[PDB]
Amino acid sequence: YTDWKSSGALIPAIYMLVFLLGTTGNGLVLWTVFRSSREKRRSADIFIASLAVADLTFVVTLPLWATYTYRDYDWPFGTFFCKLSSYLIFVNMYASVFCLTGLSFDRYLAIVRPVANARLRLRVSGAVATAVLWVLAALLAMPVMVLRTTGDLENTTKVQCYMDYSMVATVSSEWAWEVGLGVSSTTVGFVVPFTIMLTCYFFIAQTIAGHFRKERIEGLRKRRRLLSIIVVLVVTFALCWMPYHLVKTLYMLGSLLHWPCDFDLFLMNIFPYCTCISYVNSCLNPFLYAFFDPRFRQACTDESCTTASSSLAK
Amino acid sequence: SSGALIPAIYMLVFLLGTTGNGLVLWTVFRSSREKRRSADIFIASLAVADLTFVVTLPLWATYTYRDYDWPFGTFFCKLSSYLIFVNMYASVFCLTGLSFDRYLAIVRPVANARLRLRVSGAVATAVLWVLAALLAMPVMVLRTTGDLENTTKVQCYMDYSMVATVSSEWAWEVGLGVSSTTVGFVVPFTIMLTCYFFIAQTIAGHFRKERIEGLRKRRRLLSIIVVLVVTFALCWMPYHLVKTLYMLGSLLHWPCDFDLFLMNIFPYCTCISYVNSCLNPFLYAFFDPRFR
Amino acid sequence: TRVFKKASPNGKLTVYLGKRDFVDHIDLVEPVDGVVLVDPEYLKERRVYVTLTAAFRYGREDLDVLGLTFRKDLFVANVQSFPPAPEDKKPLTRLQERLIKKLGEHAYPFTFEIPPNLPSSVTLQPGPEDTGKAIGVDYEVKAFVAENLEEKIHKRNSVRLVIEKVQYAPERPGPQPTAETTRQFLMSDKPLHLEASLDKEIYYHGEPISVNVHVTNNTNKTVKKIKISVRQYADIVLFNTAQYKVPVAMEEADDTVAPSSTFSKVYTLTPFLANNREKRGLALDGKLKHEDTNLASSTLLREGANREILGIIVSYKVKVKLVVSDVAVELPFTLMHPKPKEEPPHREVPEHDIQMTQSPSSLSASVGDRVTITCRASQSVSSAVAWYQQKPGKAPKLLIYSASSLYSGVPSRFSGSRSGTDFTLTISSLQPEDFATYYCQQYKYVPVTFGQGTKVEIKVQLVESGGGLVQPGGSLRLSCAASGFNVYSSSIHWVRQAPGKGLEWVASISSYYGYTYYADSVKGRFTISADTSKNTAYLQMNSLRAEDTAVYYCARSRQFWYSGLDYWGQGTLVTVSS
Ligand SMILES: COc1cccc(OC)c1-n1c(NS(=O)(=O)[C@@H](C)[C@@H](O)c2ncc(C)cn2)nnc1-c1cccc(C)n1
Numbered sequence A: 001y002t003d004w005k006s007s008g009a010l011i012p013a014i015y016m017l018v019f020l021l022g023t024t025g026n027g028l029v030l031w032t033v034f035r036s037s038r039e040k041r042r043s044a045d046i047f048i049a050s051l052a053v054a055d056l057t058f059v060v061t062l063p064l065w066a067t068y069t070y071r072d073y074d075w076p077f078g079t080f081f082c083k084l085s086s087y088l089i090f091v092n093m094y095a096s097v098f099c100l101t102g103l104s105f106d107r108y109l110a111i112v113r114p115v116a117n118a119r120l121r122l123r124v125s126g127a128v129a130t131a132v133l134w135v136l137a138a139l140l141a142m143p144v145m146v147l148r149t150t151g152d153l154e155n156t157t158k159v160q161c162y163m164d165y166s167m168v169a170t171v172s173s174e175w176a177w178e179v180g181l182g183v184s185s186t187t188v189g190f191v192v193p194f195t196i197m198l199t200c201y202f203f204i205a206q207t208i209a210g211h212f213r214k215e216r217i218e219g220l221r222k223r224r225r226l227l228s229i230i231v232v233l234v235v236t237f238a239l240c241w242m243p244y245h246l247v248k249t250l251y252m253l254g255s256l257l258h259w260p261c262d263f264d265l266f267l268m269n270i271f272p273y274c275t276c277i278s279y280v281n282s283c284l285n286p287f288l289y290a291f292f293d294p295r296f297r298q299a300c301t302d303e304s305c306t307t308a309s310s311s312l313a314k
Numbered sequence B: 001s002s003g004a005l006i007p008a009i010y011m012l013v014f015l016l017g018t019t020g021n022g023l024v025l026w027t028v029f030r031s032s033r034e035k036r037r038s039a040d041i042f043i044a045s046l047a048v049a050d051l052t053f054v055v056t057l058p059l060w061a062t063y064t065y066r067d068y069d070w071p072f073g074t075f076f077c078k079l080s081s082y083l084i085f086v087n088m089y090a091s092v093f094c095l096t097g098l099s100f101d102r103y104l105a106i107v108r109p110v111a112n113a114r115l116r117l118r119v120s121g122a123v124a125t126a127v128l129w130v131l132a133a134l135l136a137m138p139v140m141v142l143r144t145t146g147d148l149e150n151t152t153k154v155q156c157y158m159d160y161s162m163v164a165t166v167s168s169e170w171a172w173e174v175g176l177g178v179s180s181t182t183v184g185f186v187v188p189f190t191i192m193l194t195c196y197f198f199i200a201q202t203i204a205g206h207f208r209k210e211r212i213e214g215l216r217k218r219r220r221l222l223s224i225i226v227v228l229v230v231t232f233a234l235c236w237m238p239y240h241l242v243k244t245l246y247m248l249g250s251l252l253h254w255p256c257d258f259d260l261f262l263m264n265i266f267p268y269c270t271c272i273s274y275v276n277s278c279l280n281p282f283l284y285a286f287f288d289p290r291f292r
Numbered sequence C: 001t002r003v004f005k006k007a008s009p010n011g012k013l014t015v016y017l018g019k020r021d022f023v024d025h026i027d028l029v030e031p032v033d034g035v036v037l038v039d040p041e042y043l044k045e046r047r048v049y050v051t052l053t054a055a056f057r058y059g060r061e062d063l064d065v066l067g068l069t070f071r072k073d074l075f076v077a078n079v080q081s082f083p084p085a086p087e088d089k090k091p092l093t094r095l096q097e098r099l100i101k102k103l104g105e106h107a108y109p110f111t112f113e114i115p116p117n118l119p120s121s122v123t124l125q126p127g128p129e130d131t132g133k134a135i136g137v138d139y140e141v142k143a144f145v146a147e148n149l150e151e152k153i154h155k156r157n158s159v160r161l162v163i164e165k166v167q168y169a170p171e172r173p174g175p176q177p178t179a180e181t182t183r184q185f186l187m188s189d190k191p192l193h194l195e196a197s198l199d200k201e202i203y204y205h206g207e208p209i210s211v212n213v214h215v216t217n218n219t220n221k222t223v224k225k226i227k228i229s230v231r232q233y234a235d236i237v238l239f240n241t242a243q244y245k246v247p248v249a250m251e252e253a254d255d256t257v258a259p260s261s262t263f264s265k266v267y268t269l270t271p272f273l274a275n276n277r278e279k280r281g282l283a284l285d286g287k288l289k290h291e292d293t294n295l296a297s298s299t300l301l302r303e304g305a306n307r308e309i310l311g312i313i314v315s316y317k318v319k320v321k322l323v324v325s326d327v328a329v330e331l332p333f334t335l336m337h338p339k340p341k342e343e344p345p346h347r348e349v350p351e352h353d354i355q356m357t358q359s360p361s362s363l364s365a366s367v368g369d370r371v372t373i374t375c376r377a378s379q380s381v382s383s384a385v386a387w388y389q390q391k392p393g394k395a396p397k398l399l400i401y402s403a404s405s406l407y408s409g410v411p412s413r414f415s416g417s418r419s420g421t422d423f424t425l426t427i428s429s430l431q432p433e434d435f436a437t438y439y440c441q442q443y444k445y446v447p448v449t450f451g452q453g454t455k456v457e458i459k460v461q462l463v464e465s466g467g468g469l470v471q472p473g474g475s476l477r478l479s480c481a482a483s484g485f486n487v488y489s490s491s492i493h494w495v496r497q498a499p500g501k502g503l504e505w506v507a508s509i510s511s512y513y514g515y516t517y518y519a520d521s522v523k524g525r526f527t528i529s530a531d532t533s534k535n536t537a538y539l540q541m542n543s544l545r546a547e548d549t550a551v552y553y554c555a556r557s558r559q560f561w562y563s564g565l566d567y568w569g570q571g572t573l574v575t576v577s578s
C-alpha cells in the first residue's frame, strides 16, 4: 500500500513541469483573448476564455501540491489553503471538461445546425451558457470545500491535507458517503459530459464528411484534415481524462471486488501519474484549441463592377 | 482588547480596498489605449499595487486576530510580507511619478520640452516596479517563521541569522531599515513636495489678476492640494515616523514607556496607512477632470 | 426599352439581361433569357458558359470553423452560349432578338428553363448585430470564360448578375381563409367556440389584414387577453426539416369576454418591417444588395404536389389566441405583391443633388398643334421621372410615370420619351384642356427635384387642412387625411409651391420601412409623422422663414414600386408675415 519509490521524487517534477507549461499557455491565451475580445466577438471566445481560466487556476494550485508530495505526502501550508487549493483543482477539472463540451455544443450549432446558429443570439447565448457553466462547476465542487482538511498525523507530525469525510460520514457510513460523493464526482465529471461530447462530435464528423464528399478532390483532402482534427481532439480528451476516471472506479471497486493488493498497489502507484495525465488536458488545451483558432494566432503575431443600363430601339 | 479591535480595522480596509481599487482598476482597464496616457498608466499601476496591498491583507488580519500568531503556512508569510512592502513602495513611487509628470506637463513642456515619451511611460513604470522588488528583496530574505516561544505560535519575524554575528544584528537591521524607510517616505515625499511647491509658486505668480471663476478655481485648487498632501501625510508619515523612532531609540535609549507605545501605535497606523491605498481611487476619480 | 447590362472586371464579357426579377408561374417559370456579348479577339479558342446558380447559404462567414464551407447549391444549370451548335435548338425570344439586333457579332443567347419546384429567392434577416451574408436562397447568373466546366473559374473574367425569383399573386382570388376551434376545460357547460375569418386569401404587401374574431364564453372560465399575431413561418427543409416561427405583426388587446357572453370584433393588423428589423431569422424578399426589402412573399407551391422543396418555403398565417383565466386558431393567408406593370425597382427608388433644368418656361400654341416640352437632369435618372399638369391654382395631376408609361385615366395626347438625361413630353394635339404648366420630377434620389415649370399657353383624394398664415417664426401642423390609402403601403410626399415657381419637396414619410426624409433646405424644423389609426399625415412646422410662404400639397404614392405622386390634395395656402 506504499507509493512507488521513484514517485516521491518524480511526481513533484511532473507536477511542476505541468505548472510551468500550463501557466505559460493559459496566461498567454487569456491575455490574447482579452486583447482580441473586441476583434473576435465570437460566442466561442467566451468559452475559450472560460477554459483558459479553468486551466490556469488548475495549474496555479498544483505547485503547492508538488512541494507537498516532495515532503513525503505532508501539507506544509495552512488548512484554509488546503481547502482552497483542493476546490480550485476540482472546479478547474470539471470546468475544463465542461468548457470543452460547451465548445462542442457551439460547434454542433455552427456546423450541423447552421440555421439555428444564425437565428440564435450567439452573443447573449454564449454569455448565459458560460455563466451557467461556471456556476454549475462551483456548485458541484462545493463539497470539496469542507471534505478536504488537514490532519492525520499518525504519530509522525505529518499534517496531511486529505479528503476528510468523518465530518459528514458516520463510521459505518464512511464508505457509503465516500462512494456517493465519488460517484457524483465521476458521473458529473465525464459520464454526462463525455456522452454529450460523443454524440456532438459524431454528428459533427458525419456532417463534415458529407459536406466535403463533393465539389473537388482537394475538398476530400480538407475533409480528411478536419476529420483528423476532430479525431485528435476527442482522442486527446480520451487519453488525458479516461485514466483518472478508470482508476477512480478501480480504487472504489477495490472495496467491493477486493482487487489484489499487488494490483491495488499498482493502482496507487499509477494514480499520481493519472493525475498528471489528466492535467495533460489543461497542458495541451492552449495548443488544442487556441492554436486551431486563427484569431488567437493573428492576435499573438478584384472588383465585380456595378450594374449599368442601356436603352434599345423599337 | 486592541489585539482584537485592530484586526477588525484590517478587515474593514480589506473590504473597502477591494471595492474601491477593483472599481478603479475596472474603469482604467475599460479606457482604451487611445484615451489612456502616461497618467492613466501610472494610476493603473498604483491601483494594482494598492489592490495587491489590500489583497495580501486577510492573512495578516487572521494573524493579528490570533495575537501575532501565523497558522497560514511558513512560506506564505514571507510572500505576503514581500507583496506588502512591494505594493506600499510601488504605490508611493507611482504617486510621486504621477505628481512629477503632472508638474512636468502642466507648464514645463511649453517652457522646456525635455521628457520621456508617454510610450516610454510603460518602461518607466516597469523600472519603478523593478526597483520596488529589489528593495523588497531583503524583507523576504530575512522572513522566516517560528514560534519564538515555548508555545505553538509560529510567526514570521524577519530573521537576521544570515549575518552570523549576534553583535551585528542590531547594526545590520538598523542600516537596512533606515535605508528602506528613507527610500520609502523621505525620497518620494521630498520629491513630490518639491513638485507641489513648484506648482504652488506657479499658481501664486499666475493668478494675481482676478477672473470671473478665479475664486472657485482657487478654492478647488486649494482643496486639491491640501487633500493631496494630507492623504499621504496622515497615512505614510506616521508609519515611517514611528519606524524611525524605533530604530533610533536604542542609541537614544528612549525609556520603555515610548518604545512599547511605539509598538502599540504601529498596528493602528498600519491601518491608517492602509486606508490611503483604499481612498486613492476615490480621490483620483473626483479630481480626474479637475487635474486635466 | 432599357435593358440591364453588367461587364466583367476585365470588360470583354458583358451580360445583357432584360429584367432582374422573373415571374414564377406555378406550373412553369419564365425563361431566364438574355445575351452575353463577348469579344472574339480576346477568346482565341475559349468558350463562354452562362450558369444559373440557386445557392442556399446557412452559416455566416463560410469556413467559419476553418474549412467548412457553409453554402449549398439547391439547383444549378449551365449553358454553353458559345459556340451555339444546332444541338441548342433554342428559339429566340423577343428579348433576345431585340438585343441581338441592338448588338452585332457578339450575339450569344442563353436560356434557362429553371425547374418548377424551387424555393423563392427569400433571404433571411442578416441580423442587426450579426455580420455576414444573409442565410437564405439566392439566384445568380454568371457568364464566365472557360474551356471546361470544371476548369479554373477566374474572378477577373467572371460576371455576376443576381436574379430574383418572386411569385406574384394569382389573378383568381382564393377562398376565405377562415378557421374554427373549440376546446373544453374544467367546466362542463360548453367548450369555447372560436371562429376567425380574414377578408381574403391574398393581401397585397403592407395592405391591412382584417382579422374578424368571434368567441363564446358560455362557461365561467373567462378570457383576460386577446392577441392577434401575423406570424411568418420559414419552413427550412435543409438537412433537418423544421418549421420556424417569427411574429411579424402583433396586436395584444385587453378586450375580455364575460361568462355566458358572446363576443365579436374585427381587428386590423398590418405587417411592416420597420418594427421588425431586430427579429433575427425573419424572411425577407429578393435582394440584389443590402438595400431594404419588404417582408417575405408567401411561397406558392404546386397545388398538392409539394415534396417539401429544399430551402426556405415562406408561409404566413394569422394566429388569434385568447388566454383564459390558451385557445388558438390560425388563418393561412398569402401575403404577396400584385403583378406590377413595370419592372420592380429593387434599389430604393428615391435612394439616399440633381437639378431639374426644365425648358421652355413659356410657349404659346393654338388648339391641336404639335409641341414638345423638354427637360434635363444634372445626373442620370434612368427613366425614373414623372410629369404633372398644374392648372392655375389646381392640384397638379400625374400624367407620365417612368418617362414612358401614360398614367391610367389620362388621355394619350401626352407621350413620354427618354434620351440620355433629356426627358421629353410630346403632345399629339393641344386640346383646350391644356391651360396648365407642366412639371417633371425625378424620384431616383431623395432630393425630389421637381420641374422648374414649363407653362404652355393654349392661345380617391387626400383632404389637406390645418394651415395658419401670418406666423413670422412660429410653428404649425398641417393635417392631410387620406380617404382610401393606408400609409403602410403608401408614402406621403408633402411638397410646397412658392408663388409662380415649381414645387419644392418638403417632407417624405414611408411608414413601411420607417425612415423619413426631410427636405435639404428645411431640415430640423419641418417634421412629418403619419398616424395610422386615422391614416392622417401630420406636417409639423417650426421656426417659419419669410420664404416658406407657399401653397402646400400632401401627396400619395404606392410604397412599393414608386410610380409617382398620383393622388394629391387641393392645396392649402400658408403665409409667413406679421
Ligand atoms: C494524486 O492525487 C492528488 C494529489 C494531491 C491532491 C489531490 O486532491 C486534491 C489529489 N487527487 C485525489 N486524491 S484521492 O483520490 O483522494 C487519493 C488521496 C486516494 O483517495 C486515491 N488513491 C488512489 C486512487 C487510484 C484513487 N484515490 N483525487 N484526485 C486528485 C487530483 C485530481 C486532479 C488533479 C490533482 C492535483 N489531484
Ligand SMILES: COc1cccc(OC)c1-n1c(NS(=O)(=O)[C@@H](C)[C@@H](O)c2ncc(C)cn2)nnc1-c1cccc(C)n1
Binding pocket: B060, B081, B084, B085, B088, B156, B157, B158, B246, B262, B263, B266, B267, B270
Ligand atoms: C505592524 O506592522 C506589521 C504587521 C505585520 C507584518 C509586518 O511586516 C511587514 C509588519 N511591519 C513591520 N514589522 S515586521 O516586518 O513584522 C518586523 C520584522 C520589523 O520590520 C519591525 N520593526 C519594528 C517594529 C516596530 C515592527 N516591526 N514593519 N513594517 C510593517 C508593515 C508595513 C506595511 C504594511 C504592514 C501591514 N506592515
